[PDB]
Design a protein around this ligand. Structure first.
Ligand SMILES: [Mg+2]
Ligand SMILES: [Mg+2]
Ligand SMILES: [Mg+2]
Ligand SMILES: [Mg+2]
Ligand SMILES: [Mg+2]
Ligand SMILES: [Mg+2]
Ligand SMILES: [Mg+2]
Ligand SMILES: [Mg+2]
Ligand SMILES: [Mg+2]
Ligand SMILES: [Mg+2]
Ligand SMILES: [Mg+2]
Ligand SMILES: [Mg+2]
Ligand SMILES: [Mg+2]
Ligand SMILES: [Mg+2]
Lengths: 176, 322, 236, 376, 111, 158, 43, 109
RNA sequence: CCUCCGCAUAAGCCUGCGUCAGAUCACACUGACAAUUAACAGCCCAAUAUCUACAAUCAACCAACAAGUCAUUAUUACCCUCACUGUCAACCCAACACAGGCAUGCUCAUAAGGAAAGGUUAAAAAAAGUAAAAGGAACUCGGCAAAUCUUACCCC
RNA sequence: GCUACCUAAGAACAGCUAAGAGCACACCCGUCUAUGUAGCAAAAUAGUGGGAAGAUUUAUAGGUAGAGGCGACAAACCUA
RNA sequence: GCUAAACCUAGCCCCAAACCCACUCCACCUUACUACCAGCAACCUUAGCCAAACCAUUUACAUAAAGUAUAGGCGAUA
C-alpha cells in the first residue's frame, strides 16, 4: 500500500523521533546474500518514506523532525553496497583474476592524454562498425607540443604550491 | 485553442468527464438467414479468404476486422431492405469523418498577459466512425422532450486538463458524414471498432479491468453526441437558439468478438454558462454491457454464436423514421 | 564542399530521373563556369545512343516501333520513345519521325549497299555515298557521339578501304571506320535555330544567368580570322 | 554506355600493404589493438557472419540458391502492370475476340436519375470536410454508391440477396501460349461474388464461329513486352478463397483507378486491357477449380464481368472464357468503351455556371444496372 | 537501476533482472489540485513509466492503472557573489492512477 | 628541397626549387624469397644492385640508414628470417637447390630471435612487444590452491 | 545591427565539437582551449 | 546562445528535441510506421523478496557492540572454502557457457 | 478612447509579473515553494533482385511551355506492441521594459488585444495638423511642400 | 546565422481591368520632403512614391574564404 | 560631518632541488557528455616586419683561442 511511503501515523508531528544507528560494515559483512537482498528492500522503502517526509517538510516551510535518520539510512545503504560489491570482486578474482568487471585498455586519444577507455558492449565486431572507426585513438605530431605545454603548466602550479608551503612554514617559525 | 476530445480514449474514468463535457445522463439498458450471413461474414476474413502477406497482431484490427464489419453492415442492409424501405433510400458512409465543436464552461486564465480574463473553454470531438447510415427523414423520439430522470451528472472536481486531455488550435469543424447541400442530413446506426490500443487483453494486462466497459461507454457518449450536435446545427439550432425537437441517433461500437449497443438522445446544445443557469434539460444515453457476439472460431466453425446480439443489431437497423 | 554528382544511376531506365543543378560549380564548390543556374526544374530521360544494341539474348538486326515523339528539356533535339520485342528505350528523334512508324536497326555491312529511310540506323559501310546522317559513332560499339543537335546533319563524302569520310556539321571532316553505326537523315526539331528568345526572362528560365558588367577591351584574338579548314582527322 | 560515374561508384579499397607480399613473416597490424592507426599496417579480417538470425537485420540468399527458382522466365501480370498496347495485346495474351457492344440479354435485363445525380454530387463535393475532394477519395466512393443503389433493388429482385461484394480478394492464374509461360496476380479493387454462376451469353454454335478469325499479330512490339518478367515465380494457380466458401462464383470485378496524378492513372485502352486480363484470370481460376488441371475446350464456359474504373469515365467488360487450352476456338469478350457519366463537375461556382455536375448521361448508369443484374 | 551498464539483449537470451534497485522515489502533494486516484511521485530522470509501474507493483504491492511521466526544468536564473549561474536540478514527475477505484488522499503530516 | 639563385649570380633573385629523382617501375626476382617484386626503383638503386650483384645481396649488404625504405627494411628482415629458420622456399624436389641458395648467403644470417625485430619502426616494435606479453590474467584461485598444496606438502614433510 | 539570427542546428554544424574534431586545425583549437583552461571548449 | 548551460533534450529545435532523451535507457526498437516494439526481456523486472517473517529492521540497536573492520579479500574467501580442499588431500575454467558472468558482467547490479 | 492589429504554429530563447515570505513615476527585484501529463509533434521503415513514357493548372473542352511535386512487383525474412523526448512564460535578433527586424495558419473589425493625456498653465522659438479676404507661381535653383489633378514637347 | 552568389527540398501573391500587361491589397523596395541627427535607431518615424504571377518575394538546410571568394562592375558584398 | 580615509595577508615573482600529470559508478568523436548493427585516414624548406638611414643579393636567433681565420651589394653586418 501507499501508506508505506509514510511512517507510523503516531509519529506525525512529534518534532523528534527515535532511530537507533546505521548498519556498520562488519555486521553487514557477516549477514548472508539472501538476507542482504531482503535487508536492501527494507532499507529502500524506509529511504523513500524519509525522502517523502523531507519533501513534505519543504512544502510546509517546517523543519524536519529527525533528519539525521535519513543520513543514517543512506550510510547503511552505502555500506550494504560496499559489502556485496566487495564480495563480487572477490568472486571475480577467484574465478577469472580480473580487477573491475567492465573492461578497458589504456587508450591514447586525439589530445594525447591517456584515457581509461571503458568498453561499451554491442552486437557487431569493431572492424565493420561505422560509428566506432571514426572514433580515433591516436595523436599525430601537433599534439605533442600541446602536451608539453600542459606538462609545463602543471609543473608551474606544483612549484607555486611547494614554494607557498615553504613560505608558510617560515612564517610559522618566525611567529613561534 | 480548444480541448481535443477523443471518443476512443485511453484515459481512465473518461466516461464521467465526457458526460460533464456534454451534459448527459447515462443509463443502463436500452430505451436464420441473417444468422447464416453473419456466420459467413465471420468466416470469410478469419479463414476462407486466403491472405497473401502474413498477418500480425499490430495489423489485426485493421486487416481482419474493419472489412468484416463493413460486410456485416452492407449485407445486413441488403437483407433488411424488404423489411425496411428507408434503408434502401438512406445513404451509407464508410469511415467518413464526423466533427463537432461545443463550448461548456468558463475559465479565468491562470497566467500570462491574459491572466484574470474570462475564457469560455472549448471542445471538439473529431471522429471516423467505421461506418454510418445517413437518412433524409429524421428518426423518432425514444423519450419525450424534457424528461427529468433524476440520477444526476458527475462533478468535475478538478480541471479538464488533469484527465489526459490536450488543447490545440486547428480549424473548428461542425460536420456530419457530408456537407450542407445534401438530402441525407440525419442518421440512425453508427458503427465503431475500437483500435488495437483498447483491446481487452491489453486492459487485462494493465490493472484497469474495470475500464473495459468504460471505454466503450465513453466512445458512445462522444461520437454519437457529436453526430447529434452536427445534425442539430444542420437544422439551425445553437446553444442560445436551443433545439425544439429531440435529435436522436443510434450506434453500436464493437470489437471482433464483443459488441454493445448505444442510443443517444440530444435534448440540448445549450452548454454555455450563459444558458445552463436556466436549464432543466439534459441529453441522455442508454446502453448495454459488452456481451460477446461469439466465443471462438476453430478452423471454419464458430463454437458458440450469440443470436441476442444479432437481434439487437437488427432492431437498431430496423427502426423507421415516423 | 559536399558534392555527390547526380549521375549515379547504374541501370538503364525509361523513367525520368531527378536532375540536380550544378550552378557551374565544381566538386570543390567554386564556380568554374560562369553564368549558369536558376532555370526550370528538369528530369533526365536516359538516351540510348548505342543505336544498334540488340535486345538481350538476340544478335540480328533489330526492328523498332515509335511509340511517341517528345520534347527533351535536357537538350536541343526532340526525342523518340522506341519499343521493340520486350524492351523500350529513348532515342534521339530524326526529322519527320512520328508515332506508329517502324524503324530498322542493322549491323549488316552490305556489299549490296542498300538504300535507307530517314529514321533507321546502319553501318556506314552499307550507306550510299552522299546520304545525310546523324548520331555517328567514333569507333565501333563506342556509341553515337557526333551530330546530335537539333536540325544538324553530316554527310558521307566517300569510302576508302575499311573507312568512310564524314563531313561534320562544322565542315571540318572526319575519317571513321566502315563498320561504325550512324542513323540516316537529319536530327529533328529543325528550325530550332530560328527561335527568338523574346525577353531576358526566357533566358533566365533556360538556366542561363546574365553576363557580367565588367567592360573588357577586345584584344588580338578579336579580329575576324579567315583560315583554311583544319586537316581531316582520323580514328584508324 | 556505362552509366554510373566513377566518383559515385563505391570507393576502390586502398592498396594492400606491401609487407603482405613478403613470404613469410608476421605483419604487425592494428588488429592487435582495436582501433585504426596510420603507422602500423592495415590488417585483413575474415568475412564475418552472424550466429543468430535477427529479422530486423536479415540478409537473404542470392537468386542463384533460392528454394523454388526456375530457369524458364515467367511473365506475370498485375494491377500496376500497364502494357504498351493496348486492347489488342491483352486479347492476344488472353486468346479472345472483342465485340464492339455489350450483349443483348444484358440490355434486355434493363427494360431514377435524381439518385444517380445525388451520388455523383456526393462523391465530387459533399463527402469530405475540405472543399473539392481528390481522386483517391471520390472515385471508389462513387462506385460504392452506385453499387449500393443497385442493391436497393433487392425489394424488386429477391435473388439479389444471395451475393456479396468483397475488397481484398487476391487471386492467381498461370498458363502457356506460343509457348512461353505467363501469369496473372490479384486485385487492388472490389469483387462481387455470388452463389449461382452466370449463364452463358454466347451459344455453342457462336463459339464454333470464333475459329475463323486469327488473333492479331503486331510485330515488332512482341508479347510479352510490359509484363513483369520473373524467375522464382511458382506455377500453382489459385482462386481467392479456401474450399467451401459460400458466394464463391465471381460475378463482377469492381476494380478502380484512383491516383490523383495524370501519370499514375492507366490511360483508357491500357485500363481496358487490364480489366480483360483480370476477367480471364478469375475465369481461368474458376475453370481450374471446376474441372481437372489438364487443359481442354470447355463444356460449360464460365462468364465473369468487370466494371471500368474512374469517377468520370466507365469501361464495361463481360468475358466468356470457353477454352482452358490456349495456343481452335477462342474466348469472346465484349466492351462498351469509355462511356462516361458526367463530363466535368464544378465544385465551386464561376463568374454563370452552377455548382453541380454537367453533361450527365443516364445510359451509362443503365448499363451499370444491367451489369449488376445479369444473374437475375 | 540508475548509473549502471545495462546488459545487451541480442535476440532470444534471458530476461533482464534487477536485484537491488539503485533508484529511489518520493510521493508528493500535488499543488495544482489533481483528481482522486492520481498519485504524484518525484522520480529519477533515468526511470521509465514502465519501470515505475513495475517498481510500485513489486515493492509496494500497489495496483497501478496508468502512469504518466513528465520532465520538469529546474531554474537556472539564479546568481551568486561570483555572478555564476546556480542551477536547480531538472527532475521527473509522475502522475500514477490507482486501479479498481482504490482512491488516495495525501495525508496531513505536520499537524 | 632547396633554393636557387636565378642565373647563378647571387645578385640575381633567389627562388625555391624541388629536385625530384627519376622514378621507374620494375620487377625484381629475389632468390631467398622465390618471388618477383615490382619496385619503384631509381637508376641509382639499379646501379647499387648491379654493384652488389644480387638484389638479395644488396638488401642484406645495404645498411639500414643507407637502404632508405620501410619496404626494403621489411624485405631484409624477411630474408634474415628465411636464412635463420631454413624454411622451404622451393618446397620438395629442390632440397639441394635450397641448400645451394643458403650457401650463397652464409655471410649475414643472424640468430632467429634478432631477425624478427630487424627493420621495424618504434611503434610497430612496441605493438609486437605488447602482443608477446599480453596473455590472460591468471586466476588467483589457482594460485591459492597451489599455495595450499605446497603448505600441505611441507606439513607432510615435517 | 542584428547580424545574428540564431538557429541551433546551424550553430552546431558550424562550431560544434564534431566539426572541430574533423580537421587538424579544429583539433588544435580544442587543444588551445584546454591549455587556456577554458570552461567551454567548443560550441 | 549560452554554451555554459548544459545541452539537453529541451534545448534544440523539433528534430533535435525528439532525438536526445535523458539517461532513460530503451525498452525496445521502432519500425514500419514508427511503431515502437516494447520487448518484455529488455524491460527490467524487479525481483522483490517476501518480507513477511523478516526480523531485520532498517536500524541497529545502540547496545550492539563494535568490532574491528576486515576488508573481505579473495584470500579470506578462499580460506572460507578451503576445508573441502583439505579434505581432498568449486571453480570454472571458462564462464562463457554461464548465465551470470562475473567478468564481462551480465547481471545488473 | 484606440485597434497599422489579435489568437496559434515554426524558429528562437529557457522559468523571465504562478502561491507565500522578504526588502527598497509609484510598490515584473531576492528566498522558498509550486508547476508543462499525449492522442499533437518529434523519434521510422529486413534483404536481394525487378519496376516507374504520358505534368500541374476545380483537369472536362480549349491551350500550351519554362517540360514538371505524391506508384510498385517477385522471392526470401518475420508475432514484440505504444517505450523515450518537446509541451510554462508577458518570450526571439537588435547593449535597454529599444517607434526597428521576424517565416507560416487563421481572424480582416475583431468574440481578440491595448491606453495617445503625472498635475497646471497656455508665452516666445520649434514640430504636426486644420483656417482662410483678394490675388492667384508674382515664391524659388526648380511649383520643393501643399490640393485639385491632368495639356503638349524635347534630351538620354 | 549579415550580405554576395549558388545547390537541395518548401511556401505566399486579395480585389478590379484585361502578356517579364494596367490599376491596387498583403508582402518587396526606398523617389522626394519634413522630423530625427548621444535619435524610437551605430540609418529610424511620418507622409509621398517604384515594384507587387515574376529576371518576383521568402522560411529551412547546405556550398564557395582572403595572394581568395562572390559580383545584372557599382572596385559592390564577404556578420556595424 | 558626510563622502571618504587608512590597515596585512591572500597570494605571487625570481632562483635552487627533484624528471611530472592523468579509471568512486555512469557518460563522452552521432548535434561530446548520446546504452544497442556491415568502411577515407599523418608526415612536404618557413616568411616578413626589420637593418642596410630607399631597395632588389644580404641582416645573428662554463672560460679562452676570438670577435681571430673566413663570409659579405667585400656593407650592413655575419
Ligand atoms: Mg559589358
Ligand atoms: Mg502552449
Ligand atoms: Mg477588448
Ligand atoms: Mg500615456
Ligand atoms: Mg505632461
Ligand atoms: Mg487665400
Ligand atoms: Mg519667377
Ligand atoms: Mg510635389
Ligand atoms: Mg506586373
Ligand atoms: Mg503596377
Ligand atoms: Mg544581384
Ligand atoms: Mg565603373
Ligand atoms: Mg631599410
Ligand atoms: Mg618607401
Amino acid at each position: 500500500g501507499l501508506e508505506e511511503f509514510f511512517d507510523d501515523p503516531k509519529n506525525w508531528g512529534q518534532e523528534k523521533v527515535k532511530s537507533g544507528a546505521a548498519w556498520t560494515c562488519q555486521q553487514l559483512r557477516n549477514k548472508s546474500n539472501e538476507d542482504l537482498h531482503k535487508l536492501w528492500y527494507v532499507l529502500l522503502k524506509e529511504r523513500n518514506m524519509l525522502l517523502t517526509l523531507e519533501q513534505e517538510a519543504k512544502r510546509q516551510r517546517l523543519p524536519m523532525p529527525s533528519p539525521e535518520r535519513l543520513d543514517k539510512v543512506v550510510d547503511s545503504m552505502d555500506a550494504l553496497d560496499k559489502v556485496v560489491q566487495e564480495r563480487e570482486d572477490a568472486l571475480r578474482l577467484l574465478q577469472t583474476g580480473q580487477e573491475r568487471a567492465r573492461p578497458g585498455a589504456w587508450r591514447r586519444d586525439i589530445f594525447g592524454r591517456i584515457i581509461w577507455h571503458k568498453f561499451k558492449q554491442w552486437v557487431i565486431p569493431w572492424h565493420l562498425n561505422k560509428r566506432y572507426n571514426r572514433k580515433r585513438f591516436f595523436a599525430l605530431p601537433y599534439v605533442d607540443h600541446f602536451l608539453r605545454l600542459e606538462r609545463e603548466k602543471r609543473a608551474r602550479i606544483k612549484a607555486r604550491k611547494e614554494n607557498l608551503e615553504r613560505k608558510k612554514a617560515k612564517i610559522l617559525l618566525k611567529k613561534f | 485553442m480548444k480541448y481535443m476530445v477523443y471518443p476512443q480514449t485511453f484515459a481512465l474514468n473518461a466516461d464521467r468527464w465526457y458526460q460533464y463535457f456534454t451534459k448527459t445522463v447515462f443509463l443502463s439498458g436500452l430505451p436464420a438467414a441473417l444468422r447464416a450471413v453473419a456466420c459467413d461474414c465471420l468466416l470469410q476474413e478469419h479463414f476462407y479468404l486466403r491472405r497473401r502477406r502474413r498477418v500480425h497482431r499490430y495489423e489485426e484490427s485493421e486487416v481482419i476486422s474493419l472489412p468484416f464489419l463493413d460486410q456485416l453492415v452492407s449485407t445486413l442492409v441488403g437483407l433488411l431492405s424488404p423489411h425496411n424501405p428507408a434503408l434502401a433510400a438512406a445513404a451509407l458512409d464508410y469511415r467518413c469523418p464526423v466533427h463537432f465543436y461545443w463550448v461548456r464552461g468558463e475559465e479565468i486564465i491562470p497566467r500570462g498577459h491574459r491572466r484574470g480574463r474570462i475564457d469560455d473553454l472549448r471542445y471538439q470531438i473529431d471522429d471516423k466512425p467505421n461506418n454510418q447510415i445517413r437518412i433524409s427523414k429524421q428518426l423518432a423520439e425514444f423519450v419525450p422532450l424534457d424528461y427529468s430522470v433524476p440520477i444526476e451528472i458527475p462533478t468535475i472536481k478538478c480541471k479538464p486538463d488533469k484527465l489526459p486531455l490536450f488543447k490545440r488550435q486547428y480549424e473548428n469543424h461542425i460536420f456530419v458524414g457530408s456537407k450542407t447541400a445534401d438530402p441525407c442530413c440525419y442518421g440512425h446506426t453508427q458503427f465503431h471498432l475500437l483500435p488495437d490500443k483498447l483491446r481487452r487483453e491489453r486492459l487485462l494486462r494493465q490493472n484497469c479491468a474495470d475500464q473495459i466497459e468504460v471505454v466503450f461507454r465513453a466512445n458512445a457518449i462522444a461520437s454519437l453526441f457529436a453526430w447529434t450536435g452536427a445534425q442539430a446545427m444542420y437544422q439551425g439550432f445553437w446553444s442560445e437558439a436551443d433545439v425544439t425537437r429531440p435529435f436522436v441517433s443510434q450506434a453500436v461500437i464493437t470489437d471482433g468478438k464483443y459488441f454493445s449497443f448505444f442510443c443517444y438522445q440530444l435534448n440540448t446544445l445549450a452548454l454555455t454558462t450563459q444558458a445552463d443557469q436556466n436549464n432543466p434539460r439534459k441529453n441522455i444515453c442508454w446502453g448495454t454491457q459488452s456481451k460477446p457476439l461469439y466465443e471462438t472460431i476453430e478452423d471454419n466453425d464458430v463454437k458458440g454464436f450469440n443470436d441476442d446480439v444479432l437481434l439487437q443489431i437488427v432492431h437498431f437497423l430496423l427502426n423507421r423514421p415516423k | 564542399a559536399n558534392f555527390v554528382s547526380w549521375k549515379s544511376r547504374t541501370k538503364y531506365t525509361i523513367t525520368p530521373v531527378k536532375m540536380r543543378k550544378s550552378g557551374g560549380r565544381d566538386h570543390t564548390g567554386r564556380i568554374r563556369v560562369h553564368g549558369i543556374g536558376g532555370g526550370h526544374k528538369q528530369r533526365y530521360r536516359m538516351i540510348d545512343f548505342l543505336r544498334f544494341r540488340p535486345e538481350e539474348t538476340k544478335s540480328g538486326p533489330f526492328e523498332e516501333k515509335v511509340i511517341q515523339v517528345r520534347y527533351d528539356p535536357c537538350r536541343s533535339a526532340d526525342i523518340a520513345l522506341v519499343a521493340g520485342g520486350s524492351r523500350k528505350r529513348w532515342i534521339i528523334a530524326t526529322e519527320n519521325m512520328q508515332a506508329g512508324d517502324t524503324i530498322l536497326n542493322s549491323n549488316h555491312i552490305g556489299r549490296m549497299a542498300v538504300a535507307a529511310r530517314e529514321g533507321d540506323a546502319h553501318p556506314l559501310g552499307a550507306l550510299p555515298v552522299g546520304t545525310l546522317i546523324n548520331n555517328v559513332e567514333s569507333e565501333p560499339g563506342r556509341g553515337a557521339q557526333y551530330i546530335r543537335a537539333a536540325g544538324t546533319c553530316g554527310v558521307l563524302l566517300r569510302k576508302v578501304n575499311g573507312t568512310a569520310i564524314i563531313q561534320l556539321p562544322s565542315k571540318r571532316q572526319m575519317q571513321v571506320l566502315e563498320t561504325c553505326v550512324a542513323t540516316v537523315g537529319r536530327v529533328s526539331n529543325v528550325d530550332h535555330n530560328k527561335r527568338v528568345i523574346g525577353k531576358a526572362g526566357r533566358n533566365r528560365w533556360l538556366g542561363k544567368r546574365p553576363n557580367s558588367g565588367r567592360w573588357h577591351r577586345k584584344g588580338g584574338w578579336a579580329g575576324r580570322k579567315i583560315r583554311p579548314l583544319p586537316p581531316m582527322k582520323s580514328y584508324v | 554506355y556505362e552509366w554510373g560515374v566513377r566518383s559515385t561508384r563505391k570507393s576502390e579499397p586502398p592498396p594492400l600493404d606491401r609487407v603482405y607480399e613478403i613470404p613469410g613473416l608476421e605483419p604487425i597490424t592494428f588488429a592487435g589493438k582495436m582501433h585504426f592507426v596510420p603507422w602500423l599496417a592495415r590488417p585483413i579480417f575474415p568475412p564475418w557472419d552472424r550466429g543468430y538470425k535477427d529479422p530486423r537485420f536479415y540478409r537473404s540468399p542470392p537468386l542463384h540458391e533460392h528454394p523454388l527458382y526456375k530457369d524458364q522466365a515467367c511473365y506475370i501480370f498485375h494491377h500496376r502492370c500497364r502494357l504498351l498496347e493496348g486492347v489488342k495485346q491483352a486479347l492476344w495474351l488472353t486468346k479472345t475476340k472483342l465485340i464492339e457492344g455489350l450483349p443483348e440479354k444484358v440490355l434486355s435485363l434493363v427494360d431514377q436519375d435524381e439518385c444517380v445525380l445525388n451520388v455523383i454530387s456526393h462523391a465530387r463535393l459533399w463527402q469530405t470536410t475540405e472543399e473539392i475532394p481528390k481522386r483517391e477519395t471520390y472515385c471508389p466512393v462513387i462506385v460504392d454508391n452506385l453499387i449500393q443503389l443497385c442493391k436497393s433493388q433487392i425489394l424488386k429482385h429477391p435473388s439479389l440477396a444471395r451475393r456479396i461484394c468483397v475488397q481484398n480478394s487476391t487471386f492467381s492464374a498461370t498458363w502457356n501460349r506460343e509457348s512461353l509461360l505467363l501469369q496473372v496476380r490479384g486485385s487492388g479493387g472490389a469483387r462481387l461474388s455470388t452463389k449461382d454462376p452466370l449463364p452463358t451469353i454466347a451459344s455453342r454454335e457462336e463459339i464454333e464461329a470464333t475459329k475463323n478469325h486469327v488473333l492479331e499479330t503486331f510485330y515488332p512490339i512482341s508479347p510479352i513486352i510490359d509484363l513483369h518478367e520473373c524467375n522464382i515465380y511458382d506455377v500453382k494457380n489459385d482462386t481467392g478463397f479456401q474450399e467451401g466458401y459460400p458466394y464463391p462464383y465471381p460475378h463482377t470485378l469492381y476494380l478502380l483507378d484512383k491516383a490523383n496524378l495524370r501519370p499514375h492513372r492507366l490511360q483508357p485502352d491500357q485500363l481496358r486491357a487490364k480489366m480483360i486480363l483480370f476477367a480471364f484470370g478469375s475465369a481461368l481460376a474458376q475453370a481450374r477449380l471446376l474441372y481437372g488441371n489438364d487443359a481442354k475446350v470447355l463444356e460449360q464456359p464460365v462468364v465473369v464481368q468487370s466494371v471500368g474504373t474512374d469517377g468520370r469515365v466507365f469501361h464495361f467488360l463481360v468475358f466468356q472464357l470457353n477454352t482452358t487450352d490456349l495456343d481452335g476456338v477462342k474466348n469472346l469478350a465484349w466492351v462498351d468503351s469509355d462511356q462516361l457519366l458526367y463530363q466535368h463537375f464544378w465544385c465551386l461556382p464561376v463568374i454563370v455556371e452552377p455548382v453541380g455536375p454537367v453533361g450527365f448521361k443516364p445510359e451509362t448508369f443503365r448499363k451499370f444496372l444491367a451489369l449488376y443484374l445479369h444473374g437475375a | 537501476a540508475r548509473n549502471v551498464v545495462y546488459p545487451l539483449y541480442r535476440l532470444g537470451g534471458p530476461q533482464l533482472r534487477v536485484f537491488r534497485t539503485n533508484f529511489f522515489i518520493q510521493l508528493v502533494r500535488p499543488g495544482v489540485a489533481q483528481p482522486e486516484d492520481t498519485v504524484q511521485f518525484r522520480i529519477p530522470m533515468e526511470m521509465t513509466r514502465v519501470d515505475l509501474r513495475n517498481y510500485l507493483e513489486g515493492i509496494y504491492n500497489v495496483p497501478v492503472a496508468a502512469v504518466r511521466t513528465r520532465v520538469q526544468h529546474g531554474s537556472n536564473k539564479r546568481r551568486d557573489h561570483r555572478n555564476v549561474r546556480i542551477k536547480k536540478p531538472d527532475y521527473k514527475v509522475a502522475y500514477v492512477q490507482l486501479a479498481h477505484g482504490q482512491t488516495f488522499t495525501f495525508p496531513d503530516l505536520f499537524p | 628541397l632547396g633554393q636557387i639563385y636565378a642565373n647563378n649570380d647571387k645578385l640575381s633573385k633567389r627562388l625555391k626549387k624541388v629536385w625530384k629523382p627519376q622514378l621507374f617501375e620494375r620487377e625484381f626476382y629475389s632468390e631467398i624469397l622465390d618471388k618477383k617484386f615490382t619496385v619503384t626503383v631509381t637508376m641509382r638503386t639499379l646501379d647499387l644492385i648491379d654493384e652488389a650483384y644480387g638484389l638479395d645481396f644488396y638488401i642484406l649488404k645495404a645498411s639500414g640508414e643507407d637502404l632508405c625504405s620501410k619496404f626494403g627494411m621489411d624485405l631484409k628482415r624477411g630474408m634474415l628470417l628465411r636464412l635463420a629458420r631454413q624454411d622451404p622456399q622451393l618446397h620438395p624436389e629442390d632440397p639441394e637447390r635450397r641448400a645451394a641458395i643458403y650457401d650463397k648467403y652464409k655471410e649475414f644470417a643472424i640468430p632467429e630471435e634478432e631477425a624478427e625485430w630487424v627493420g621495424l619502426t618504434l611503434e610497430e616494435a612496441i605493438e609486437k612487444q605488447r602482443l608477446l606479453e599480453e596473455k590472460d590474467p591468471v586466476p588467483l584461485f589457482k594460485i591459492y590452491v597451489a599455495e595450499l598444496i605446497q603448505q600441505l606438502q611441507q606439513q607432510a614433510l615435517s | 545591427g542584428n547580424e545574428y539570427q540564431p538557429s541551433n542546428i546551424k550553430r552546431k554544424n558550424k562550431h560544434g565539437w564534431v566539426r572541430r574534431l574533423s580537421t587538424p586545425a579544429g583539433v588544435q583549437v580544442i587543444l588551445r582551449r584546454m591549455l587556456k583552461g577554458r570552461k567551454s571548449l567548443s560550441h | 546562445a549560452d554554451r555554459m548551460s548544459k545541452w539537453t533534450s529541451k534545448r534544440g529545435p523539433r528534430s533535435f528535441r525528439g532525438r536526445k532523451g535523458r539517461g532513460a535507457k530503451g525498452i525496445g526498437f521502432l519500425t514500419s510506421g514508427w511503431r515502437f516494439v516494447q520487448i518484455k526481456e529488455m524491460v527490467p523486472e524487479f525481483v522483490v523478496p517476501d518480507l513477511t517473517g523478516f526480523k531485520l529492521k532498517p536500524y541497529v540497536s545502540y547496545l550492539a557492540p563494535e568490532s574491528e573492520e576486515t576488508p573481505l579479500t579473495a584470500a579470506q574467501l578462499f580460506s572460507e572454502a578451503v576445508a573441502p580442499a583439505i579434505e581432498k588431500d568449486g571453480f570454472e575454467p571458462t564462464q562463457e557457457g554461464k548465465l551470470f558472468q562475473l567478468y564481462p558482467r551480465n547481471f545488473l547490479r
